[PDB]
C-alpha cells in the first residue's frame, strides 16, 4: 500500500505501450483505431510484446530512446533494454499484427548490480542524440555516471566520478571560449546538469565523438542568486532542463518547492579585482539565477479554525515531465496527484534578452511581478482519511490526428485522459486581467477502497473548499 | 460511519456544481 511513484507507460507512433510487471510484457493499444467508430469487437488492436529474457528487478520507469527503436526498463536494481519489433502490414502493426510478439531484451551492467548489493540506480537517461547509436547514462548511489553503448553491455564507454539524485540534458550548445586550447572550430556538446540532494547543481559538457580532456570535466557547484538563508533546501529530488534559450533549470524538492533557475553565462572578471585565485584556469563557471520559487499544493489545504494542528508536511518525491508542445510548460507527477506549471514570464525574458542593452522598458516589464501559472490537474488524495492512488504512468500525446492530451494511469489502473491546451492597453487585456485565475479545483479521484464512507466532516470541508474556489 | 458522510459531502458538492452551472448558464443567457 506504500505504492511508489512510477512511469510504466510510453507512446510510440500513436500506440500506447503499458508495462505489465506480472507478465513482464508491454500491452500495446493503437490510439488512432479508438477514434474510428468501428461497429465490431472491443479487442481490435491490442498486441502483447513479450520479453525474451524478463527483468530480474522491479521496473519503476520506462524510457523511449531518441531513435524510437529501444525502450529502457529501469529499476533501482538494474536496467534492461527492449528492442522494439518491426512494423509492417496493412495497419502498420508490430510483426504484421501478431497478437503476441517476442521482443529481444538486453540487460545493461547486470554484473555491477548483482555483485554490489548496496548499489542503487538513482536515475537512467538516454544520451539526447537522434543520429548516433543510443547510449544510456546511469546515475548510481556511488556518485558515478556510467555511459553504456548497446553494442558493449558489460564495459561502460565512459565512467565519470562526481567526487547525486538527478541529472538532465540541456540543448546542444557551443562550448564557452577556454574549453580547449587553440581549436578555431566551435566545438558543440550537450550540457549535462547534475543535482545533489543538497540542492547543489553541477555542469558537465558531454560529447561522445570527441575524447578531449575538457569534455567531461565537472564544473561547479554553480553559484545560485540571490543568496537564500536556507541555501534553497536539502531535500532536492528532481531536475529538469527546459529547452529554452537561455536554459531554464527546474529544481524540485520533496516538500513541493519548485525553483526556476535561469542559466547565466560566466563573466570574464574585468581586470580590477585581481585578489588571489592562483588557479590559472579561468573556467567561466555559469551561474543559476533563481527567478521564481513555487510551492505545490501536494495535498488539498482545508481552512481549519485550528491554525496549530501540526502541518503534517506532506512531503513526497516529485517527477518532472517536459511538455513536447509548449517549451515554457512542464508537468509534475507525485504520489497524490499531477500539476502543470507554465512560465508566464518566459516570452518576456526572451523579449528582454533579444532587446539591446538600452531597453529599460523590457526590464521593467520583466520585473513587473508575474507568477507562473500552477494548475492542480489531478488529485488522487482528495481527503486526509484516504490513502493516495499513486501515478504509475504519465505521458503527453502530441499527435496531429489525436490532438494534444495528457494520459495518467494510477496504481489501481484508472486511466485518466485530459486534453491539454497548446486607457493603457486594449479593453480586452483589462477584461482578461479581471478573469485571470490563480487557482482551480483539481479532478478528484475517488480511490475505490470499498469499506467506509469518508467522515461527513471531511466531505463538507472538501465541498466548502471547492465552492469557495468557484 | 465515514462512508455515508463522505457520500453526503460528495452529493452536496455535485448539487452545488449543478446549481452554479445553472446560474452561469442563466447569466450567459441574460448577457
Amino acid at each position: 500500500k506504500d505504492k511508489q511513484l512510477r512511469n510504466l507507460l510510453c507512446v510510440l507512433d500513436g500506440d500506447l505501450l503499458v508495462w505489465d510487471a506480472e507478465e513482464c510484457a508491454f500491452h500495446t493499444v493503437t490510439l488512432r483505431s479508438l477514434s474510428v467508430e468501428s461497429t465490431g469487437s472491443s479487442s481490435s488492436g491490442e498486441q502483447k510484446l513479450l520479453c525474451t529474457n524478463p527483468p530480474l528487478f522491479d521496473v519503476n520507469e520506462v524510457l523511449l530512446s531518441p531513435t524510437q527503436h529501444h525502450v529502457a526498463l529501469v529499476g533501482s536494481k538494474g536496467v534492461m533494454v527492449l528492442e522494439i519489433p518491426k512494423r509492417w502490414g496493412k495497419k502498420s502493426e508490430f510483426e504484421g499484427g501478431e497478437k503476441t510478439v517476442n521482443c529481444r531484451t538486453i540487460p545493461i551492467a547486470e554484473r555491477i548490480f548483482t555483485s554490489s548489493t548496496s548499489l542503487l540506480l538513482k536515475q537512467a537517461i538516454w544520451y539526447p542524440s537522434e543520429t548516433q547509436e543510443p547510449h544510456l547514462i546511469l546515475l548510481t548511489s556511488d556518485n558515478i555516471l556510467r555511459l553504456y553503448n548497446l553494442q558493449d553491455l558489460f564495459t561502460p564507454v565512459k565512467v565519470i566520478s562526481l567526487s547525486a539524485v538527478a541529472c538532465d540534458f540541456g540543448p546542444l550548445a557551443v562550448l564557452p571560449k577556454g574549453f580547449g586550447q587553440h581549436s578555431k572550430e566551435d566545438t558543440v556538446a550537450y550540457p549535462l546538469y547534475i543535482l545533489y540532494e543538497t540542492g547543489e547543481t553541477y555542469l558537465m559538457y558531454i560529447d561522445l565523438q570527441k575524447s578531449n580532456i575538457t569534455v567531461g570535466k565537472l564544473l561547479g557547484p554553480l553559484p545560485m542568486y540571490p543568496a537564500a538563508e536556507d541555501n534553497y533546501g536539502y531535500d532536492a529530488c528532481a531536475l529538469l532542463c527546459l529547452p529554452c534559450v537561455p536554459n531554464i533549470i527546474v529544481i524540485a524538492t520533496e516538500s513541493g518547492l519548485l525553483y526556476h533557475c535561469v542559466v547565466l553565462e560566466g563573466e570574464e572578471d574585468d581586470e580590477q579585482t585581481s585578489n588571489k585565485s592562483w588557479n590559472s584556469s579561468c573556467d567561466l563557471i555559469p551561474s543559476l539565477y533563481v527567478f521564481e520559487c513555487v510551492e505545490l499544493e501536494l495535498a488539498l489545504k482545508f481552512a481549519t479554525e485550528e491554525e496549530e494542528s501540526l502541518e503534517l508536511d506532506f512531503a513526497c518525491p516529485i517527477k518532472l515531465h517536459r511538455d513536447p508542445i509548449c517549451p515554457s510548460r512542464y508537468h509534475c507527477t507525485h504520489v497524490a496527484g499531477v500539476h502543470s506549471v507554465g512560465l508566464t514570464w518566459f516570452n518576456k525574458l526572451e523579449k528582454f534578452l533579444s532587446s539591446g542593452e538600452e531597453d529599460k522598458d523590457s526590464l521593467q516589464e520583466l520585473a513587473a511581478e508575474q507568477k507562473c501559472l500552477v494548475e492542480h490537474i489531478l488529485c488522487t488524495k482528495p481527503l486526509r482519511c484516504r490513502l493516495p492512488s499513486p501515478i504509475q504512468g504519465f505521458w503527453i500525446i502530441s499527435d496531429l490526428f489525436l490532438g494534444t492530451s495528457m494520459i495518467c494511469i494510477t496504481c489501481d489502473f484508472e486511466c485518466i485522459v485530459r486534453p491539454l491546451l497548446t486607457v493603457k492597453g486594449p479593453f480586452e487585456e483589462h477584461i482578461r486581467g479581471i478573469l485571470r485565475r490563480n487557482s482551480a479545483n483539481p479532478l478528484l479521484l475517488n480511490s475505490s477502497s470499498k469499506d467506509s464512507s469518508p467522515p461527513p466532516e471531511e466531505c463538507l470541508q472538501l465541498l466548502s473548499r471547492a465552492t469557495q474556489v468557484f | 460511519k465515514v462512508t455515508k458522510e463522505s457520500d453526503s459531502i460528495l452529493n452536496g458538492i455535485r448539487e452545488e456544481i449543478a446549481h452554479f452551472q445553472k446560474e452561469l448558464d442563466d447569466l450567459k443567457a441574460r448577457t
Partner: peptide, 29 residues
C-alpha cells in the same frame, strides 16, 4: 468515496467554466 466525489465536482466545475466562457463570448458578440 470522498475522493471520487471531489474528482466528479472538479470535472463538473471545469465543464461549467468552459460553458460560461462560451456564453460570455456569445453575449459579447
Amino acid at each position: 468515496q470522498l475522493e471520487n466525489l471531489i474528482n466528479k465536482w472538479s470535472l463538473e466545475l471545469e465543464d461549467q467554466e468552459k460553458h460560461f466562457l462560451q456564453q460570455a463570448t456569445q453575449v459579447n458578440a
